[PDB]
Amino acid sequence: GPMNISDIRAGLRTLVENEETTFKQIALESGLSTGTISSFINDKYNGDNERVSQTLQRWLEKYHA
């Protein structure tokens, strides 16, 4: 199911909220910058948010698997 961008950020919050992951670890595993993840979740990142969403999906897929 090609979840909406809203679902992607809605999952990342749950993981950091319960210490299941960190901004640093997500950044390292996704190959993105720490600041990007926070801004993407904050729905304040200015740039190709779709590029970021697609990268984060792959990360969430391996996490939840």
Swiss-Prot record:
Where does the source fall among the domains of life? Viruses
Q: Give the DNA-binding residues.
A: 23-42
Protein localization: Host cytoplasm
Disulfide feature: none
In the induction comment, the record states: Expressed in the early phase of the viral replicative cycle. Expression of early genes is repressed by viral Repc (latency) and favored by viral Ner protein.
Describe, as the record does, how this protein assembles with itself and its partners.
Homomultimer. Polymerizes in presence of ATP, preferentially on DNA. ATP hydrolysis triggers polymers dissassembly. Interacts with DDE-recombinase A; this interaction stimulates the catalytic activity of the latter as well as the ATPase activity of MuB followed by its dissociation from DNA.
Q: What is known of its domains?
A: The N-terminus region contains a putative DNA-binding region that allows filament-filament interactions and probably favors MuB polymerization and filament clustering. The central region contains the ATPase module. The C-terminus comprises four helices arranged in a loosely packed bundle which can bind to dsDNA.
Q: Say which family it is in.
A: Belongs to the AAA ATPase family.
| Chain's role | Selects the target DNA sites for transposition. Recruits DDE-recombinase A to the target sites and catalytically activates it. Displays non-specific DNA-binding properties. Polymerizes as helical filaments around the DNA. Coating of the DNA by the target DNA activator B might play a role in favoring target-primed replication over integration. Prevents self-integration into an integrated copy of the viral genome.
The protein's name: ATP-dependent target DNA activator B
The gene from which this protein is expressed is: B
